[PDB]
Amino acid sequence: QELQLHYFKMHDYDGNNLLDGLELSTAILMSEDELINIIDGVLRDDDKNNDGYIDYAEFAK
Amino acid sequence: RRFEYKYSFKGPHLVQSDGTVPFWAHAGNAIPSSDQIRVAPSLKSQRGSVWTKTKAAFENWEVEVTFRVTGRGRIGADGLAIWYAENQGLEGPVFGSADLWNGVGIFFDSFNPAIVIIGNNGQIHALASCQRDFRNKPYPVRAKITYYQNTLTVMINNGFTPDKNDYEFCAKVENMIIPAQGHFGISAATGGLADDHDVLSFLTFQLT
Ligand SMILES: [Ca+2]
Ligand SMILES: [Ca+2]
Ligand SMILES: [Cl-]
């Protein structure tokens, strides 16, 4: 879990304690269509208020 | 506001290992790097552009574009354009892009300096403007361009301070219609005089 918190923080380049889709793109040459499918799925599953950002609780479910 | 990653770019891992910007196409002498895209470098007679690969279909939207225009002259050229247009702009004499588009260009015209909002219906070759010196500023200049309920507003952070949220009014166009679906883009150009035109980030939001 501490590894997991570390994954979250290490990809939060702007330091807002949220992950967006560009940050997620770095956290996985994979094609852009496959990348899009994966990122869209994460956002669908995690982003409760549909603002394009996920916090740590949402990331960890 | 909903951040829209697929219509956005930023550092510090802006470019992929093959030199591409995810979700965006670049043309001419635009050079992507890890923390910024040099849309046109401070060399003579340059043109470059970066455009979203797909169209956005947002009824209302807002973009925040952070950039620098840097050069040795007290005067520089040519400037940078931020675009929302039905089609990807091919190359041309309008800040690196073609002179006919269907949509809106927000032009940072160095050679003044002035910021001008130009609309086009895909059948023409200035709706509002302001004067701002956006060149050689100590902190990045930012443009926040909002299209909401048929009103286009441009706010500018002039880069005199490190406060990234210090935006001041530039211009507004009321009762404006633009393509329902279109690409976002940036282009830049130089002539005999030449500045580096660098875009650090292009952040797109859908408004509801
Ligand atoms: Ca973040
Ligand atoms: Ca959220
Ligand atoms: Cl962001």
Numbering used by the authors:
A (entry chain B): 70 to 97, 111 to 143
B (entry chain A): 44 to 154, 162 to 175, 186 to 268
The authors write:
Incorporation of the cargo glycoproteins into the transport vesicles is mediated by transmembrane cargo receptors, including ERGIC-53 and VIP36. These cargo receptors are termed leguminous type (L-type) lectins because they share homologous carbohydrate recognition domains (CRDs) with structural resemblance to leguminous lectins such as concanavalin A. ERGIC-53 (ER–Golgi intermediate compartment protein of 53 kDa), the most popular marker for the ERGIC, functions as a cargo receptor between the ER and ERGIC for certain glycoproteins, including the lysosomal glycoproteins cathepsin Z and cathepsin C and blood coagulation factors V and VIII. ERGIC-53 consists of a CRD, a stalk domain, and a transmembrane region along with a short cytoplasmic segment. However, biological role of this stalk domain remains largely unknown, since binding of ERGIC-53 to its cargo glycoprotein cathepsin Z or immobilized mannose was not affected by its oligomerization states of ERGIC-53. It has been shown that ERGIC-53 forms a complex with MCFD2 (multi-coagulation factor deficiency 2), a 16 kDa co-receptor possessing two EF-hand Ca2+-binding motifs and thereby operates as a cargo receptor specific for factor V and factor VIII. The data provided a working model of cooperative interplay between ERGIC-53 and MCFD2 in interactions with FV and FVIII; MCFD2 binds the polypeptide segments of these coagulation factors, whereas ERGIC-53 captures their N-linked glycans.
